[PDB]
Ligand binder design. Structure first.
Ligand SMILES: N[C@@H](CCC(=O)O)C(=O)O
Ligand SMILES: N[C@@H](CCC(=O)O)C(=O)O
Ligand SMILES: N[C@@H](CCC(=O)O)C(=O)O
Ligand SMILES: N[C@@H](CCC(=O)O)C(=O)O
Lengths: 311, 306, 306, 311
């Protein structure tokens, strides 16, 4: 049986971290499980320090186990998954899992999610697919997966390109793998980093104030992600502030508040004229992840656009 | 044939000579209210449309409002709450340029006029008609950045579908709209200041602080999950709510309700949960709620009724 | 607390001792009507349920019908048309075995009892409650073979969502149901014979012929696209319709309506278009239509009202 | 500019077949287009003869062009696409396209669909992805694509595993390719075949008659696909008839009328006991396609199951 390490970041999702083999006994039949509690927070409080800790821990311990399961709150699991997708250099399976119902509730989903997460982490076919999220019997790639519903146990979906595989009776039929470069195919190396560039997100809507953008500019933010309207469009005053900021060296990425589809280039905004970058299918919080990492290598917008075209 | 007024707010989405077939279904008159891209939509345009519709209700049988798609879902809900005409009011746009191949404008406008001319469309609130489907202004949202099929009432579904100029309506919104709401903008020249802040890992409190520092009347949080807030943002909005600012917890998550009685003790902090209203829609209702009350309990009641 | 009757048609989906929390929301009494897998569901079970509900309506405050998921969408629509009790009638099942990890039965049953106990659930027709969502028996269908979230009202959306034992109902079906329909099965021991044939490339006419040869009262076509038929199948159903057999064009396509006035001249052939009713649901209504009429125009009217 | 051949099977979808460069002039700017009318039928009348004609024509003419666009009715395009996905041996791009609105209607979708189909057929990156369906700005693989709505121009979706790529401004960001074996990676060779094994489809529902199944058995059908309920389940009398048939050498595949998800093995039906095959995510009409082709190589159910696990 394979050795699987569970890295916990929050409360339990089934039934300390060493107690999960008791909570979900069937795990014994599929893996030799060891648990470590990395942090214990709600994922609404996820932050750069925990991301760096997780990436370094996985990269350091890669040789000591056959795969990783990370238990994580669902609120920001899609952010952590993509960060790790880009910074983990272990090509053994790394699988994130959470639960939408409390472990104490009727029909709690945590136990079967964890079982299926371990199944996936133990499946040799899961390797080299990047970091994965396993929720509701489905294997999802860390780039495209997103929380689509506030309460549904089926909330996590790779809205644009679909899941990689479905799990039935502890076996996975994989039919897809992400084409975008991940893990050891990216140049992002966080092994020595203590911090990440500062990147904030502003929202666009009718009559939007420019004060959120201005405040981030005034604080010297390295980059700003716009949750635009439609195909990445900006309310005039937010546009104005970000246009000025970009000329001063602020990296500016146009993403969209629209939950599916790509903020494309060659649409309504002349990105080359303004020094902006279009985020593609990356939603604002995912665009932030890649923008922070891009900024550890380049402040040049054309090179950042190239990064957003490859990863 | 019904008299239908088209109120234009942007460029043409088609091209009445553009769509001659309108003549077969209505007597169409057009007035250009403003001409802007809807990414620049604003309070002033909203007030103008609501007043124009309420003033001209008796002069026509229904209204079509051509509009850019980017913020159509916001305008539709504002009008859904403030229009007192219960004749059909229908919003429509195009996802492809009117000069492009397989432009969607022409048939979208046609079906929008069909809807506004249909007696059965009355009393259903303000409507959005896109891709052969009639959608209520409360639940409708733009779900994809480029798809002609982008508009969907994601939580409760559409009211009806249009085939060959006929609508089979099977649903009507139960939340109170138009003449069933207390919001009256007839005499207002401005709306309370309400902004939106986004939550995400490591979120800065600076957007929230800047709105507070500017004396905003309300702040809508685009929370994570079921309305949750990053600690720094939580800290600032908790202070705002005890300091005069209405705080509504919505969610960046595209479907489902920011519920009461989850992880945030809204009663303790003075917060309001937005239900299925997404951030930009929650903003619409909060602004209007603030024209009537600043009490968080009374705003929650508004968010439970409209 | 309301008196709620649970009518079981299969094995347990949970395990009242199984779900003790029911005691907090209702006084639950259980009767096992049949015990079968719903892939074996049949006319006799349908008649029994409709009669039992109509007879015992006055003795209880609402009903939950535990049921296998495979044909739940069929039974729900039959009861939606034939139940004359307008107290809540709620159907529920489980997509995972009650002994498996994270079994969905227990919370599904709990929410089903919540729904049947909610005064606001009355007069909405027969309901299916699955994955925290209240769905009308007409539009609800099983959309995925294994997902706990499989049940969706794909065309018009759900009626309400359930959070913490509370439902926010925002919709109700406009099509006529329960006591608003003329279908009365109180005195019937059998239903007209109606079968379903599938269309696909190179489709054999032999399934259709076999139903005709057996004297079937009606045939539902699971057409391609908007109700279209493979030539051989067309030829046989055209003959059937002129020879005593009611023919309803539905579609294998999982969402959207088989419309009148598309590629098939239904008036010429004596056919009926099923609207948004999929094949198995179209069968339900056609059987009931046939207890009242054989006239294709009158059956089309039924398919436009129910 | 690449040479693209348009094989028409039905009426025009834009604006004879040689007239399409006039109907959609912008095609001139992206390809040298030549059209041939293979048949002219509505796709509700699609049949084995047209499938064989198309596969042989593409395999024969592969060296004479840079890619193929097949114009086809939408009703059965998902069947033809999968048949060709399994029998075309040209790994140059083969793209199917149709229109949901008549060419004469307001906002007809045919013209832009054809343009995008040619874009896809001309994109070198489209090669080696199997046979494709391009509809509503989306590139879909021929195995998973299905018509989900009776009238919506956005009807075609790869419901289980998602699209391969999206098209914006005549360029495609491909992020996925089908893992299941297609085209030159399958053993199905129709070059010499004049007919296909007879395979019919029966539907399951409450109180379902066994007469449709019996009739196909009595006619000596080589195989029967069950559009089962739920996870491939059968009404008792249909079950009985198909169980008997399988013991007599009839190939029996359990698919499902449920529009998404896989008819799995190891669920409610003991397929090994009965000699049945589970169709996986193949819906009934797609299962028919693979079953017919399997039957040109084997009547053994375990080998057919293996085929349904690989293709
Ligand atoms: N806010 C909690 C919700 C619980 C959960 O879904 O994990 C978290 O994200 O950690
Ligand atoms: N930004 C444009 C998009 C095009 C349109 O929808 O008309 C607008 O929303 O006005
Ligand atoms: N074939 C079973 C599936 C399990 C269930 O839904 O209870 C049935 O429909 O009865
Ligand atoms: N029955 C026609 C419909 C037209 C179409 O959508 O192509 C066909 O499939 O050919």
């Amino acid at each position: 049986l394979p050795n699987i390490t569970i890295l916990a970041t929050g409360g339990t999702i089934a039934g300390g971290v060493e107690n999960l083999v008791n909570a979900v006994p069937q795990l014994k039949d599929i893996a030799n499980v060891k648990g470590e509690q990395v942090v214990n927070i709600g994922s609404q409080d996820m932050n750069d320090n925990v991301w760096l800790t997780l990436a370094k821990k996985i990269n350091t311990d890669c040789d000591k186990t056959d795969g990783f399961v990370i238990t994580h709150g669902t609120d920001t699991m899609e952010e952590t998954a993509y960060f790790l997708d880009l910074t983990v250099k272990c090509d053994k399976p790394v699988v994130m899992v959470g639960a939408m119902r409390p472990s104490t509730s009727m029909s709690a989903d945590g136990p079967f999610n964890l079982y299926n997460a371990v199944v996936t982490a133990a499946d040799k076919a899961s390797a080299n697919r990047g970091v994965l999220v396993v929720m509701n019997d489905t294997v999802l790639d860390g780039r495209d997966v997103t929380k689509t519903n506030t309460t549904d146990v089926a909330t996590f979906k790779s809205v644009n390109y679909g899941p990689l595989g479905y799990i039935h009776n502890g076996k996975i039929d994989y039919q897809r793998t992400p084409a975008r470069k991940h893990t050891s195919d990216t140049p992002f190396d966080v092994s020595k980093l203590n911090e990440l560039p500062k990147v904030g997100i502003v929202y666009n809507y009718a009559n939007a104030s420019d004060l959120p953008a201005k405040a981030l500019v005034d604080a010297g933010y390295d980059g700003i992600v716009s949750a635009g309207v439609g195909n990445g469009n900006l309310y005039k005053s937010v546009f104005d502030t970000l246009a000025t900021a970009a000329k001063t060296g602020t990296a500016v990425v146009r993403s969209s508040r629209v939950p599916t589809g790509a903020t494309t280039q060659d649409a309504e905004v002349d990105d080359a004229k303004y020094g902006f970058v279009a985020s593609g299918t990356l939603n604002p919080q995912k665009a932030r992840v890649l923008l922070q990492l891009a900024l550890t290598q380049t402040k040049d917008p054309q090179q950042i656009q190239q990064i957003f075209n490859q990863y």
